[PDB]
Design a protein around this ligand. Structure first.
Ligand SMILES: NC(=O)c1ccc[n+]([C@@H]2O[C@H](COP(=O)([O-])OP(=O)(O)OC[C@H]3O[C@@H](n4cnc5c(N)ncnc54)[C@H](O)[C@@H]3O)[C@@H](O)[C@H]2O)c1
Ligand SMILES: NC(=O)c1ccc[n+]([C@@H]2O[C@H](COP(=O)([O-])OP(=O)(O)OC[C@H]3O[C@@H](n4cnc5c(N)ncnc54)[C@H](O)[C@@H]3O)[C@@H](O)[C@H]2O)c1
Lengths: 429, 429
């Protein structure tokens, strides 16, 4: 077994996917036309933060199953199966899926093509893309015997290895049993693998990523109500959570590289295919408005007048245990506070150098305790678990006003009562 | 232990709750101011269809822990705890919760009150109702030492006993440890019991019943999309289903006594308390429009012109294994077909005599095979499991046109291909 694999793309996915494939004993080549990543991996410095990846590559480098390039064709040289892990960002303008990078890459594959390889769209793409590639293959390399599949990916950033190593499931969309037997032979070192049709499998990744955002934004909307009637959303989430058709926690919304656009593309692709998707249509419309309003929640907690005051922020990314600030909630929360004339200390363990390019006018620090140092208030945004065990009593002495806004509901309010702090969570009496 | 219990109300809930309480060995009195129910239970004829209830009452009648009346006070005579299981239907007009029946009953309790009993709202009520009762108690019987609780109920009709006997969870909302110890002492024969505050516990039943409707209407919206792009929603539901944060199946919508109004009251109660609930606000708006459109799905399948043709219906209720036609999908599906001038055979095993009062102009039958007999098409609506094993080949010979519309996706299309039938499910290529 132990076969030849080309991962076109070496970003957050293509790296982690291809690396784990090498741990299965497969012959793996990761490609990226950015040089800096490849000229960082060859230096054995990972570009991004994912736990476990530090060893996982550097290991399989040495055992010699894992290779890096920027030359496409070196990878596509006799590869058994070729994976496409390139970006599918939102098209500036409408919101639809920028499939150009794929369509560029799928083409550049099709020419540099020795054997009847197997083409795997792993990128979160809209539906019938695999049909459209199937034209391009036939357009470029007609008699090359190649087959086109979709196998989407479901990993959470910050748990990518374990998500990949232990999947709930994995999805494969084709009808040609040859390619079915191949993708079987690939994924065989785990022992389930779900075999649907192509367009079905393309639809699932969107449908799931939509549905999670629905679940999050639902309880968030509930959490707003829990405030005004004096309920307690942690109990409520547990209240429905013990159902077998439910594990969900209130927040200032969702974000990340994957989520908020995949909604939007699905919302769009539904529109072109002439069906409404009202629930998901509502879902972003709350969510965009939500994280902004979470900023107004702070101002209300801070009396109402935040002209010229000073605000500490804990956490910056949309998610602990990575650096992916791409569509964080926090930017919207900051920009709200700036718009009412204020000033912004901000700590993130590993987000900063990526966060700086998205952020105007923001004093970053070195330390979470320093973020509160002479602020009018401190906001917790992202639950890096280091925050979960901190000294509350330093902070009361570190503040110009004893005002704390938990937004991931970590700290039990008795502690903030004990340290005499102004408690403000999400969904609280 | 084995204590005195009064269940004010003896409808779909109050019966099944109180009966199961008697099986715990508690002294149980069920009250209803309708006579006919009480003058049916005394004849040992259950009014409604619930599996297991036939024996469960008739048993505990004989062992003498279970009693019936229409006199309220006979039940409230020295009762340890008093349950309110009366109706909370939608207020004709706005849509809000008709809390008059409660407010009538809670009052009539408060006067006929010997001991410091314990008042339990079990009816699906809006929030702070338990606070409003707490006034009425204090208004009427101030020094009577009584406490007011909410313990909502979560059973599905058609599985009520097993739902009650094996709960995922049970909810209790108060802060007075006396009443906490009582409701403990009640529910102790199971061995969890969830103890929240009052308003929180009132909110949960709505939040859950909202959230399920969201889940159903979500995949339904997805199922519409699966049609137009040729996906396969059974695989898709399974595709997301293997997530641990998911077991959901496409339909023509939801209904029943409990669901579609509890949405609406929650939507309303949120409005009075000045927060929007956009997702649930979207959820009904699809759902009302959906089941009607499912009727138009039939017409499209039936060519488009259904003036003067004839249509068979399988299933009528919103749910197999009960008779509760109250807000079925089917009525909307029928009325759509009637509005394009057609004619309607309809079989339901146990819905009919209740269904007749909601339905104009509808030839009911005795038998599912007779519903198709010389129709232009047959529609399956409700999955009574008797339908799951039927002869398809009689039906092709029983039809003026070989047209079948599965709407709960039970029959695998190969069978309908085998019997040469016009296959039409929900979310199909
Ligand atoms: N980030 C996630 O959490 C996640 C999870 C599941 C699926 N996905 C999907 O996977 C895809 C990529 O994810 P990502 O986070 O790593 O995006 P990314 O921007 O971080 O990485 C994509 C990389 O592919 C490279 N690339 C683009 N075109 C190329 C080409 N023609 N040839 C060689 N290399 C090329 C880029 O240099 C880039 O570094 C997206 O479609 C995304 O939706 C992402
Ligand atoms: N039907 C369900 O599936 C379900 C599930 C969970 C919760 N609930 C909730 O429980 C409540 C009742 O449910 P239901 O289906 O049995 O309604 P129901 O109309 O079928 O039964 C209510 C009964 O209570 C009786 N009643 C009304 N006022 C009374 C009074 N003042 N004194 C004595 N008896 C009185 C009525 O005669 C009626 O038969 C509702 O609030 C409902 O939302 C229903």
């Amino acid at each position: 077994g132990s076969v030849r694999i080309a991962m076109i793309g070496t970003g957050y996915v293509g790296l982690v996917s291809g690396a784990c494939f090498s741990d299965f004993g497969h012959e793996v080549v990761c490609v990226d036309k950015d040089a800096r990543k490849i000229e960082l991996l060859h230096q054995n410095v990972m570009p991004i933060y994912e736990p476990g990846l530090d060893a996982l590559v550097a290991s399989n480098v040495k055992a010699g199953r894992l290779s890096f390039t920027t030359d496409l064709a070196e990878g596509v040289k006799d590869a058994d199966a070729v994976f496409i892990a390139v970006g599918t960002p939102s098209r500036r303008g409408d919101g639809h899926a920028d499939l150009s990078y794929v369509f560029a890459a799928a083409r550049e594959i099709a020419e540099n093509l020795t054997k009847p390889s197997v083409i795997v769209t792993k990128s979160t793409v809209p539906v019938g893309t695999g049909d459209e590639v199937e034209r391009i293959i036939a357009e470029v390399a007609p008699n090359s015997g190649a087959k086109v599949v979709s196998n989407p990916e479901f990993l959470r950033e910050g748990a990518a290895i374990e998500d990949f190593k232990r999947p709930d499931r994995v999805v494969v969309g084709t009808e040609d049993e040859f390619a079915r037997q191949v993708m079987r032979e690939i994924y065989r070192p785990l022992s389930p693998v779900l075999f649907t049709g192509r367009r079905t499998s393309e639809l699932i990744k969107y449908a799931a990523n939509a549905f999670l955002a629905v679940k999050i934004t639902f309880i968030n909307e509930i959490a707003d109500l829990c405030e005004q009637v004096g309920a307690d959303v942690q109990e409520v989430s547990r209240g429905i959570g013990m159902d077998n058709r439910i594990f969900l926690h209130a927040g200032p919304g969702y974000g990340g590289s994957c989520f908020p656009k995949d909604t939007l593309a699905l919302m769009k692709t539904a529109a072109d295919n002439e069906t409404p998707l009202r629930i998901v249509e509502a879902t972003v419309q709350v969510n965009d408005a939500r994280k902004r309003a979470m900023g107004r929640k702070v101002i209300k907690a801070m009396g109402g007048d935040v002209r010229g005051k000073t605000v500490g922020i804990l956490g910056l990314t949309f998610k602990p245990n990575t650096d992916d600030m791409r569509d964080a909630p926090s930017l919207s929360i900051i920009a709200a506070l700036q718009d009412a004339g204020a000033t912004v200390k901000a700590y993130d363990p590993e987000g900063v150098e990526q966060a700086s390019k998205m952020l105007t006018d923001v004093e970053f620090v070195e330390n979470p305790y320093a973020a509160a140092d002479g602020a009018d208030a401190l906001v917790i945004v992202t639950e890096w678990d280091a925050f979960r065990a901190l000294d509350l009593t330093r902070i009361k002495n570190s503040l110009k006003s004893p005002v704390l806004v938990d937004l991931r509901n970590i700290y039990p309010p008795a502690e903030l009562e004990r340290a005499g702090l102004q408690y403000t969570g999400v969904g609280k009496p």
